[PDB]
Predict the structure of Transient receptor potential cation channel subfamily M member 2.
Amino acid sequence: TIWKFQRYELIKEYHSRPALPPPFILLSHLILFIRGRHKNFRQELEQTEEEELLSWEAYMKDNYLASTRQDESQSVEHRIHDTAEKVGAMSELLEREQEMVXXXXXXXXXXXXXXXXXXXXXXEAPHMFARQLQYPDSTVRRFPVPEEKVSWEVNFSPYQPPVYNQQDKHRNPGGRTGIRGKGALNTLGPNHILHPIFTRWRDAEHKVLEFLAVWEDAEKRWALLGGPAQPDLAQVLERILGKKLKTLLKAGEEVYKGYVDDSRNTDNAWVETSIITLHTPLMADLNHMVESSQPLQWREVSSDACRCSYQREALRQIAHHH
Amino acid sequence: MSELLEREQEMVXXXXXXXXXXXXXXXXXXXXXXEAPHMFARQLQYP
Amino acid sequence: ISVTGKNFYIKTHLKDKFRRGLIKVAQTTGAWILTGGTHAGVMKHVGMAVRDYTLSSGSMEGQIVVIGVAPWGVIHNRSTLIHPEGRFPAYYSLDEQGQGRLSCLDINHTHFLLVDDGTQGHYGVEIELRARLEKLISKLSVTIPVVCVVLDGGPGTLNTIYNSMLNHTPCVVLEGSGRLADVIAHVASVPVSKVTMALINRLLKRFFMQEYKNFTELQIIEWTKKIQDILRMPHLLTVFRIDEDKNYDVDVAILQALLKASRSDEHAGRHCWERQLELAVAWNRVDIAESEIFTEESQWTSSDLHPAMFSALVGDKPEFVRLLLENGVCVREFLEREETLCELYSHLPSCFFLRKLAKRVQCLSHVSEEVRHLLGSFTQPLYIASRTVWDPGRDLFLWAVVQNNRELAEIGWEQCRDCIAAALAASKILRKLAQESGEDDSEEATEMLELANHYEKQAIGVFSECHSWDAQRAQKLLIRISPSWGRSTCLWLALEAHDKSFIAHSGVQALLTQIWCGELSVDNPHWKVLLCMIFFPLIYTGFLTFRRDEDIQRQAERTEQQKCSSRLMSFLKSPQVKFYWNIASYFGFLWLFAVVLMIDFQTSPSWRELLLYVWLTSLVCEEIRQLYHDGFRRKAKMYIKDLWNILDVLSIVLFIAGLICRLQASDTVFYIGKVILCIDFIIFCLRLMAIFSISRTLGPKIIIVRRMMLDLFFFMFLLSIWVVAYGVAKQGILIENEE
Ligand SMILES: Nc1ncnc2c1ncn2[C@@H]1O[C@H](COP(=O)(O)OP(=O)(O)OC[C@H]2O[C@H](O)[C@H](O)[C@@H]2O)[C@@H](O)[C@H]1O
Ligand SMILES: [Ca+2]
């Protein structure tokens, strides 16, 4: 070791001093002093070449580093951990697959053997929002109504729903609602909601649909405006369009009508509805009136309307029909 | 373990499927309706 | 986190794992823990757990808040607390012996809400408020993540689960817990088929062993409806397998519930994933973040990660910062503002460095003083006050290898440019702090030396592969000046760093020999050089190949395969001939000085004495030229730091003292001058002796001087006491009383 260092320091000193030893360095230092860097140890490279040089150095470093990773992957102190992890995965997967491992098939075969002999001898989710325990804006908790107890077709014995109408015959179809009376509903019967068709051809009107929809409910996303009108006719819906929001040329189709789910459904009172959807994108009689509620816009998307199954089916009808 | 696994996977239903198909059919048709020889004698050199 | 687990019999293994996990999720984030306040059961269990942690940290940081909500009428000694005056410290009497209804507070909590409905006999009324509180501090701001954990339970657990999950604050259920938790863990399939009163009655007979005769039909049907309403929301609930040694504790459960909540959420993809990751770094779960949020569909930008990865670098998270730099964090964009680097050196953890740095403090520009002191001071200073090339990788690797985070430091180096320079500079600063470590720390110091050895092996590996690739480019690479890392070069920095296994590489020895022969060839032997040193025109006659002729023959050959006064002066400017010629002149100096020390030594100086005077003026002139080419007093301080030049300074000052005493007239100072000149002669001969064996280093010479003066002093001391006591015993035998 020390021979190389002695050689280095020896090379370091005598490279600097000139020729002509002290008998003539008294001359040589005098004429150098009266006369007036070094490019061997420390040299300044030009920037034209340092870029290529550093890039080649980095590629060489990359090569060395890949070689060391690969030959670090060869030693037995790594192969032991690799086989350990692989045998662990193999035993876990073998226990999982043997847990996945014919009696039913045998029974079926037996039935086939028999039934054949005999022949030879011869020849859904309910309305879950109605089941929600806290009836809205009321001090009344409903009864716990399970999923097997949904329809009226089967009988659960201690089933005593407390009747509660708001002091302002029928059975609830499709689900036991746990409370009797009209409640917040007006009549003791199927109150009908109606819904005017609000749509327009959206931007890029090839397979699109926009609709002027209202966000005045301080709730989830935009639904089209409407109202529970007088049931049974369509001119009353035209008057409801004139009232809550003349026109001659129109029609009404895609009428989803019937039992709609609510957190207000009772034993004898429930809500039903009739929602239609149908429609250049102008609709000049519809752009004539300016709608006032401030939260109301032109919903150009059909992303399931962010509301209950009525609005999701309404968005599905406009996504399928156009 | 590897030798026994190759041997057991070599021991690993088509016939059963065919039988099931026959049962499905035959049933439909019904519904529509209503040893060693004498080897010493074969020995090549007659005595 | 709210824990809403009176009679539960968990076995000790799960209780220990849950205690340690809930503490390790308490100490991490600075997070609130909400519990019912009664000292029965699991609320007192988490009270004792947080008491054990808050003794374990010594109240130095955090003081984890346990706000509790408890019903007014169910508490024991409230009339000791019912004063209309306020701010008074009241005392509570726990006594462990309350009535069968009225249980007492757990005093290991810290905050108390007591809810008062006037029922005074029932536990149930209080909860309808409590989950509402959760929504409020979920509505406070991005939103705060909210999660409840659930253990053994009863009827109260089921009601608080139901009144939580109807408010979108999701919940985790621990497996193996007993009463209600194993019930919800058993219902993991058949959303329509399993919800029957018969199967729930079978399960509640299977688990609720002792209390099963307390059931009535109204309560079992309210239970069955509640669990059907709970299980119908499968994207907020998660059953959670037991805390095992196969990389699963409560941190994984809290993360997966946060993500199965935020996946199917309405608007979580715009802003919730930020605080998701910022929490995910704090627990060091690399695989969960790697498999959950760094998926192919996210398509982020690289500048937005720059907060989060910073924390992963401020607390020594190596695998996670590899995951970040693989996923898209770029170190060039990272270090744009210098305030980030100032923050990095602010948050530097405890080591030997910052302990040595705050002394110089009592500012990134402040760091360079401790750097250039820890490094050799012959370099330039770096890290200037205002953007001295910026070079982010050098800064990051410098920070890393100072703070000694080893597996972080490899990541610091693999991203750096200018590889061999930085590798050897890391080796130099490591060996410098290894030597300068005075407070013992022997494991720390041997880790320092092992790290320096590692980087020296890395540098010689890279350079060995470069030298096997090309030859002359590697010789271009060694003598390069570096724009980065100040003003040093590789060969100088390894020479000063004394990296003993690098300078003894084949290529660097070939370059050293190729300088040491100079303009002559590198292949001829040295005895022909001595014979050329004998006769002056024999250089015209000798074989004596040159660099110019050799290369020309070599250059011409490659092409074919592919398809008077200046010459003697160029001989004269070799270093080898200069060395031999100088040492022969030095031998002649010894000969004439030894001649006129003895013989031609009259009162006035003689002829050859004047020749000795002019050779010593020649030596001091050569020395002042050496000082003139290699502030000014700083240059003198760097000059005297050698071993040969201190000997030449001592020699010339002793010669000029002996000479100025040789001007005198008295015979005593004449003899004193002869004495000084003779001891100066042997100092010169000792310098010629040390022209071969010794080196220019002073450090280990000082240490060897101390440790051998110690041993010589000690053996001389015991020799002295043996000498003195034997002599005085011999005097006490062989003389009488008088002396
Ligand atoms: N706040 C209470 N403090 C003290 N004891 C209580 C409390 N609540 C109930 N008990 C006693 O629990 C025993 C029944 O055992 P089990 O059914 O397995 O526990 P649970 O389901 O009733 O817990 C419900 C509470 O836990 C959560 O923190 C909720 O917030 C509730 O406040 C009875 O004897 C009660 O005296
Ligand atoms: Ca010198």
Summary: Residues C 4, 6-7, 36, 38, 40, 74, 103, 123, 127, 153-157, 160, 179 surround AR6 (ligand 1) (CB under 6 Å). The CA atoms of residues 322 and 669 of chain C lie 78 Å apart. Chains C and B do not touch (no CB pair under 8 Å).
